[PDB]
Design an enzyme around this catalytic site. Structure first.
Site, short mmCIF file in Angstrom:
data_model
loop_
_atom_site.label_atom_id
_atom_site.label_comp_id
_atom_site.label_asym_id
_atom_site.label_seq_id
_atom_site.Cartn_x
_atom_site.Cartn_y
_atom_site.Cartn_z
N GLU A 155 0.83 -1.21 0.00
CA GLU A 155 0.00 0.00 0.00
C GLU A 155 0.85 1.25 0.00
O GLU A 155 0.33 2.37 -0.03
CB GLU A 155 -0.94 0.04 1.21
N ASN A 178 -0.62 -8.03 -3.83
CA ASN A 178 -1.20 -7.15 -4.83
C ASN A 178 -0.20 -6.15 -5.40
O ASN A 178 0.77 -5.77 -4.74
CB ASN A 178 -2.35 -6.34 -4.22
N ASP A 185 -7.41 -5.15 -5.31
CA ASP A 185 -6.61 -5.36 -4.09
C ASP A 185 -6.84 -6.76 -3.52
O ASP A 185 -7.01 -6.93 -2.31
CB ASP A 185 -6.93 -4.33 -3.01
O1 LIG Z 1 0.33 -5.21 0.84
C1 LIG Z 1 0.78 -5.45 1.97
O2 LIG Z 1 1.99 -5.58 2.24
C2 LIG Z 1 -0.24 -5.65 3.08
C3 LIG Z 1 0.19 -5.87 4.39
C4 LIG Z 1 -0.73 -6.21 5.43
C5 LIG Z 1 -0.17 -6.61 6.79
O3 LIG Z 1 1.02 -7.01 6.81
O4 LIG Z 1 -0.88 -6.44 7.81
C6 LIG Z 1 -2.11 -6.30 5.06
C7 LIG Z 1 -2.43 -6.06 3.69
N1 LIG Z 1 -1.54 -5.75 2.74
C8 LIG Z 1 -3.83 -6.26 3.11
O5 LIG Z 1 -4.04 -6.25 1.92
C9 LIG Z 1 -4.98 -6.73 4.02
O6 LIG Z 1 -6.02 -7.05 3.51
C10 LIG Z 1 -4.60 -6.93 5.42
C11 LIG Z 1 -5.40 -7.31 6.52
C12 LIG Z 1 -4.57 -7.34 7.60
C13 LIG Z 1 -4.94 -7.82 8.97
O7 LIG Z 1 -4.01 -8.24 9.69
O8 LIG Z 1 -6.15 -7.78 9.29
N2 LIG Z 1 -3.30 -6.99 7.22
C14 LIG Z 1 -3.28 -6.73 5.90
CA LIG Z 2 -2.53 -5.05 0.11
#
Ligand SMILES: O=C(O)c1cc(C(=O)O)c2c(n1)C(=O)C(=O)c1cc(C(=O)O)[nH]c1-2
Ligand SMILES: [Ca+2]
Ligand SMILES: O=C(O)c1cc(C(=O)O)c2c(n1)C(=O)C(=O)c1cc(C(=O)O)[nH]c1-2
Ligand SMILES: [Ca+2]
Lengths: 69, 571, 571, 69
Positions: free
Chosen positions: B171, B255, B297
């Protein structure tokens, strides 16, 4: 664009109707700064150098220390 | 290593977050079963002294239990003979600014173990190896740099003498890569990126030799325009799987960045890919991209489950995976052959279906995203029909018990520049329950699946998303925690609820089990958070805030508050 | 009022923090007893989503439970038929600077109830009345001003149509006073100061007519030099008691300011005084100063327990109280006659004894404090041999089960100026375990007393101070929480431990009990903090920090971490 | 100073050996600032005034509002 028209194996992207094949020079041109784009690579380079120093010290001194230069 | 293998073969121990190398997240312990589960009660509890989301679950090595918290990532070691005494603890000193570059709550999915050491990471990018008995630091190295938006959240993975670790940050335009370190020294062995030249992505000479149509060489740059791949995401922050016989580890890359699809034309390989890499060299044997040119995403980092089952009649080494995009995938884990690709719920509309012949999703233009257009009623939403939860598999009935999300969305992108250290999303969303709930309000499901056909056996609906996952124990029970604060146990035959307990806060991790002095215990972390809890955790009110999750989970605060700890149960 | 009386007379309800007007903190519920307590198990739990010390205990009115947290003082209402749903909640918006003027952790001892309203306060000095069913605010008024160092921590006390509330802040030179407000409108009735003119202190025309030697008129200024009484302390932040027939309420005023005794020559009346005041007018009928010219911070705000027992065969209306100074006091609650004044432990050395004829402590010069001198091995320490804990009384065996502290100290004062809004202590301390523990490291005791003789019946030693207090239930059980994290039940006959459960964090409040649908439940808050936990809560390492408590409780962090919540138990 | 020598009922304080009977003018003189000493009184008066306005308004409006002045 249904993802089934592939110009090459593993390459099936198509611009959506009304959108450009190439965004460079278009209203969707991201105009990314070359320097900004290389920041991650420069970060990893410096990071790897610091780790190498830490690993080298512990290997010769037998004692691991994080802060060192 | 050999030490880890010893623990893996020790009945009653829990040395790996996913339950084992195959990541089936199950257990042969049957002391607690359908006939006596009603008598299960709380044995003891432990607070971490930290709030925010508490993902993952503790590890049990011998008579020692290791517990971890959310940021600042504290580690507590307890001897099961006396849960009231903390043998040793590690409390990191980290800059509070680290939290500012974490997308989805300051979570930590867990610790790892190997060679008599507890392998732990910190959100600020440090990876450490601590003596399991004393907590003494053997080595500490830098893996990610928060200054460029890179942080650590996933649990490390140990196989032989290697520790696998991937940074988070798609992100923020972070270019994904799986890093391999020496278990004994912490020395970097190699790293395989998700985008870029074939050398950086580390592809074997026979990469996808079995399925050429998946694509082979030069696609890490060719499926992008210019140097967009340098900030193309593809981070892997989910879970791993490993097959000792083939010496291949599996995982999924995330993503592509930014969320604005118009700003990155091309298939964007190799983001959203299921990988099969050699553990020793890191060279990829095969790779299948599930979502070419992501527009939603659907970070493809979900759990990889390895099983051995007969397909059409013949025993086959399989790999199953339920992606954020709502598709349940089953492939031959040896060569990457695509066997099953079915929707986990009929509401999925981003794809008409996945063509097993071409190996790509047949996209439905009506639910695509793009600049100057507002997509509506898109299913699944960015949170996916499955997220970071760890599901379980019952080898007896050959059934996977999946914790699913039933949330869809409205989506519209917008232009924005890339600046290292700053967020790089570029989309405004609105999320809401899917259309198939009994009262059209339900956002969670526990659904049983046959992995060889992709068909469901039964469904149990939940008010909120089943975020943490499930655990299956030989007693015939499916255990799971809910966002509203309950630990529940279901009859694995029909999903009937047999027992539950109201924990202090919602759970976002998956339960675990172990045995001590002849007694079987069930353990679960509690403390709501993660993406679903962002509104509650940071006191947000705007429905579009939290990347669009605040609005969908507005009622959560009426069922639970924050917390942080572990509750253990037994007969 | 009549509504509160209705609740008080309803079996199974818990409308008053101290258990009733007499503050005996007991219950006639006998479902759980010595023969089945071993089968008690956790029923459900609830996290407040806040850390720091969680003092007090919830209130139960009808089928509704009201839970409170540490700062920012959140209130949660739950219907016992479904603990998973928060019916209503009040989350105050307070400036974070308020925490800077709180001496001993950001604690809150609880809620009160009256006229169908939940009476609650906020640390920032506001007092509110909320509809018990909807949470709607009926009135909100200012009681204390943090700008001058005054905050609110004690539980409000409701008697008839009056709400009693006292500000905290003696460590900042705040002049103490009990404030009375109209239950229905919040209008100020009167205010009774601890120091100053007789008119401001509100003394009746017959004040101490039964014991003239206690002192009568003009002492609120005469026992000070100059205007030192203006910043003389005497805040009441402990507990109250009320006798409906005599219409007198009782409470103790706190320590004088500063801690440096040399800066305030004189008896410093009326700080550390036990009061008997008319509820309607606030006029004092009698007042007994326990510690003239305090030299040790023995803040005299501890619990007042009213009982009716035979003294030498003569039935007498009594008031009992265990002060910070280590003396157990029993007086006739009608006229203030001193009946018992005995040391709770032989280690007490600040006094040789309390002379029953002169009514004053016989001071031992060897353990006094004074400028340019370091006093050593002084017992009790400033934390006292008894602090804010609420103890229980068994009317059948006529026994009080007290939670005591066994901590002594070294003390040296120093000169400092008074600046409104800033701390005004003036002493450096070192605290450590008392001399009578089995291994000389024990700092807690549960000791049973006969209030008519002051003699102990039995003692149970605890590693850490028994800070929260005890609850007595008719089944013959003494319940209490420990700083290290356990809720325990003892046989009231000999103190034998019969049951315990490891909660998430240490408890610093006293347990409560109620009945719902024919079942008896035991409730206890958890979340260590308060003065004993300052080192842990604020990450302090200097042994002299936290007013000297950090060094004494350094081992606490090896047994528990912070938390915040409630755990309920039943058969 | 054993606390048993009272010059008047309820007034038994005595200076300890070597310390002054009165600290004004001694090395232990606190030298309190009259301006600082009156701060609390000034605060309570203003506070009572604000509450009175809140009560009056409510009693003559049927609705209670805190932020009123
Ligand atoms: O693109 C990334 O590196 C990244 C990292 C993380 C993360 O490490 O918590 C999440 C997401 N994306 C993501 O897409 C997502 O849906 C998500 C949910 C959570 C959670 O712990 O509830 N982390 C993350
Ligand atoms: Ca993500
Ligand atoms: O003088 C005061 O007004 C004042 C206030 C408070 C409080 O309200 O917390 C404490 C004290 N003093 C104090 O002397 C003390 O021992 C103490 C312990 C605690 C606690 O909750 O653990 N508060 C206080
Ligand atoms: Ca005090």
């Amino acid at each position: 664009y249904d993802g089934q028209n592939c110009k090459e194996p593993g390459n099936c992207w198509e611009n959506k109707p009304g959108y450009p094949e190439k965004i460079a020079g278009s209203k969707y041109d991201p105009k990314h700064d070359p320097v900004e784009l290389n920041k991650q690579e420069e970060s990893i380079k410096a990071m790897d150098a610091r780790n190498a120093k830490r690993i080298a010290n512990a290997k010769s001194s037998g004692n691991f220390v994080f802060d060192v230069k | 290593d050999a030490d880890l293998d010893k623990q893996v073969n020790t009945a009653g121990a829990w040395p790996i977050a996913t339950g084992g190398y195959y990541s089936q997240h199950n257990s042969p312990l049957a002391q607690i079963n359908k006939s006596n589960v009603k008598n299960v009660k709380a044995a003891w509890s432990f607070s971490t002294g930290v709030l925010n989301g508490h993902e993952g679950a503790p590890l049990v090595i011998g008579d020692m239990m290791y517990v971890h918290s959310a940021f600042p990532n504290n580690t507590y070691a307890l001897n099961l003979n006396d849960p009231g005494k903390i043998v040793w603890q590690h409390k990191p000193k980290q800059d509070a600014s680290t939290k500012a570059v974490m997308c989805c709550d300051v979570v930590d999915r867990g610790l790892a173990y190997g060679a008599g050491q507890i392998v732990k990471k910190q959100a600020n990018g440090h990876l450490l190896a601590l003596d399991a008995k004393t907590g003494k630091i053997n080595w500490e190295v830098e893996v990610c740099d928060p200054k460029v938006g890179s942080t650590l959240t996933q649990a490390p993975f140990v196989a032989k003498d290697t520790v696998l670790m991937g940074c988070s940050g798609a992100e923020l335009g972070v270019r994904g890569a799986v890093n391999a370190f020496d278990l004994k020294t912490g020395e970097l062995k190699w790293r395989a990126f998700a985008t870029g030249s074939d050398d950086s992505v580390r592809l074997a000479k026979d990469f996808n030799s079995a399925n050429p149509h998946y694509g082979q060489f030069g696609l890490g740059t060719k499926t992008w325009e210019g140097d967009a791949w340098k900030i193309g995401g593809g981070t892997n922050w989910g879970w791993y799987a490993y097959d000792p016989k083939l010496n291949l580890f599996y995982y999924g890359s995330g993503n592509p960045a930014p969320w604005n699809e118009t700003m990155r034309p091309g298939d964007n390989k190799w983001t959203m890919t299921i990988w099969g890499r050699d553990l020793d060299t890191g060279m990829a044997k095969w790779g299948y991209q599930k979502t070419p040119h992501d527009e939603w995403d659907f970070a493809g980092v979900n759990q990889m489950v390895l099983t051995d089952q007969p397909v059409n009649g013949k025993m086959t080494p399989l790999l199953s995976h339920i992606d954020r995009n709502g598709i349940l995938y089953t492939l031959n884990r040896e060569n990457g052959n695509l066997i099953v690709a079915e929707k986990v719920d009929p509401a999925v509309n981003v794809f008409k279906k996945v063509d097993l012949k071409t190996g790509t999703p047949v996209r439905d233009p009506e639910f695509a995203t793009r600049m100057d257009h507002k997509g509506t009623n898109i299913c699944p939403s960015a949170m996916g029909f499955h997220n970071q939860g760890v599901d379980s598999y019952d080898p007896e009935s050959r059934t996977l018990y999946a914790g699913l999300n039933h949330i869809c969305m409205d989506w519209e992108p917008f232009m924005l520049p890339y600046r290292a250290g700053q967020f790089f999303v570029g989309a405004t969303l609105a999320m809401y329950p899917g259309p198939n709930g009994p009262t059209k309000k339900e956002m969670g499901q526990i659904r049983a699946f046959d992995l060889t056909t992709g068909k469901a056996k039964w469904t149990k609906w939940e008010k909120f998303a089943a975020w943490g996952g499930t655990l299956y124990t030989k007693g015939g029970l499916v255990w799971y925690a809910t966002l509203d604060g309950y630990l529940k146990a279901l009859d694995n035959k029909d999903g009937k609820e047999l027992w539950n307990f109201k924990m202090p806060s919602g759970g976002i991790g998956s339960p675990m089990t172990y045995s001590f002095k002849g007694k079987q215990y069930i353990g679960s972390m509690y403390g709501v958070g993660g993406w679903p809890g962002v509104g509650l955790v940071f006191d947000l009110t705007d429905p579009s805030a939290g990347l669009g999750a605040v609005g969908a989970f507005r009622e959560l605060q009426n069922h639970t508050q924050m917390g942080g700890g572990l509750m253990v149960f037994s007969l």
